[PDB]
């Protein structure tokens, strides 16, 4: 197409939401100037907004009335800032030469462009591997990501492992101190077809919170071979994004989950969470909070004489003989906030072995003395304790 470059009209709220979407996946704070911009292409009945970061690419497609075809590359953050501050009326965009004319109401903008010649061709999304409701995907990633490592030196822990078998999806992450596992059922396009990949936690966590709405979010991995190489597409609700997977091999995590517990404790999560970080106010360096389990009570304690000492007793439904165990207060509330249930079940063994935090409903469950097996749940947050003073 010809002489008149890209020119289109669409409503502000829709234009702004799509640009705000691509620009948020475009931190792109410094140079090179090719990476700072966002590229707009009109065709057909709609407009496409594109961006790229390192490891993630964002593309948002919105309906717009295209009076003339074309593409243009304009600065990402600025045009997201403009489209949010314009009055609520239609937005007219007309590419004139090396600049773009933007008209909304009585406000007019002329912004410089960059050569579309320089914008990279961004990766293809693989074939759709399946889809799940965005509100489930949002919660499932939110639970597992909190246990993922934030580090660099250890790439293995910084990701979220995705195991796909038929209609069941299992998600896991660990920093070596804590393990989070969520198992869910989704609508799969290849049931049954098996696969396991590992996706960077931070990107997959931000993409999930972004996604909440909403439509069904679709994951694209392979056809498969078979999984596939090398990317994870996340599409749905007008947005689509690719993230390069990680090569590291995730640990085999089901050996770490205990089959039995010598003692178990069930508590109210809201009341325990507030107790922990009240007691932890005097905990030195946020190091540890101590829990003395007896039956019908647990005593939380922390602190040193140099600053202060704290104590609080809570009601517990306890089974087995008394155990005194100490956890990292931050790791501890991270798990409790992740269960998303009214009550919690603690699987215990020894003060030096893993504690298995399990979600429990409001009121269901039934257990005299002997060893108690680990009951199945869709989520598990396994935390290992800290050595006692």
């Amino acid at each position: 197409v010809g002489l008149t470059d890209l020119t289109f009209r669409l409503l502000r709220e829709s234009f702004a939401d799509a640009v705000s979407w691509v620009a948020k996946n475009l931190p792109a704070r410094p140079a090179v100037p090719v990476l700072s911009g966002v590229l707009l292409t009109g065709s057909d009945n709609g407009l496409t907004i594109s961006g790229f970061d390192y490891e993630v690419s964002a593309e948002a497609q919105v309906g717009a009335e295209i009076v003339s075809p074309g593409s243009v590359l304009v600065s990402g953050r600025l045009l997201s800032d403009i489209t949010r501050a314009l009055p609520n009326k239609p937005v007219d965009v007309h590419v004139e030469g090396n600049r773009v004319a933007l008209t909304c109401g009585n406000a007019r903008f002329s912004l410089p462009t960059m050569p579309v010649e320089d914008y990279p061709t961004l990766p293809t999304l693989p074939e759709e591997t399946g889809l799940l409701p965005a509100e489930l995907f949002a919660e499932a990633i939110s639970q597992v990501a909190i246990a993922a490592g934030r580090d660099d030196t250890l790439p293995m822990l910084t990701g979220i492992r995705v195991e796909i078998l038929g209609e069941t999806v299992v998600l896991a992450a660990t920093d070596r101190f804590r393990l989070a596992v969520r198992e869910l059922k989704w609508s799969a396009s290849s049931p049954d077809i098996e696969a396991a990949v590992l996706v960077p936690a931070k990107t997959l966590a931000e993409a999930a919170k972004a996604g909440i709405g909403g439509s069904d979010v679709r994951l694209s991995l392979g056809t498969g071979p078979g999984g596939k190489d090398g990317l994870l597409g996340i599409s749905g609700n007008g947005k689509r994004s690719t993230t390069r997977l990680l090569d590291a091999e995730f640990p085999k995590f089901r050996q770490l989950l205990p089959t039995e517990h010598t003692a178990v404790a069930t508590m109210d999560v809201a009341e325990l969470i507030e107790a922990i970080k009240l007691v932890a106010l005097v905990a030195d360096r946020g190091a540890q909070v101590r829990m003395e389990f007896a039956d019908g009570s647990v005593r939380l304690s922390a602190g040193a004489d140099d600053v202060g000492r704290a104590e609080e007793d809570l009601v517990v439904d306890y089974a087995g003989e008394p155990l005194t165990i100490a956890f990292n207060p931050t790791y501890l509330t991270d798990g409790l906030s992740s269960l998303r249930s009214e009550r919690v079940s603690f699987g215990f063994t020894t003060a030096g072995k893993s504690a298995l935090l399990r979600p429990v409903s409001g009121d269901d469950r039934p257990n005299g003395n002997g060893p108690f097996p680990a009951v199945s749940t869709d989520y598990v947050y396994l935390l290992m304790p800290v050595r006692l003073p």
């Binding site: 070596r176 770490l256 304790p385």
Partner: peptide, 5 residues
């Protein structure tokens, strides 16, 4: 702090 593996 104690480690899983």
């Amino acid at each position: 702090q104690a480690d899983l593996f």
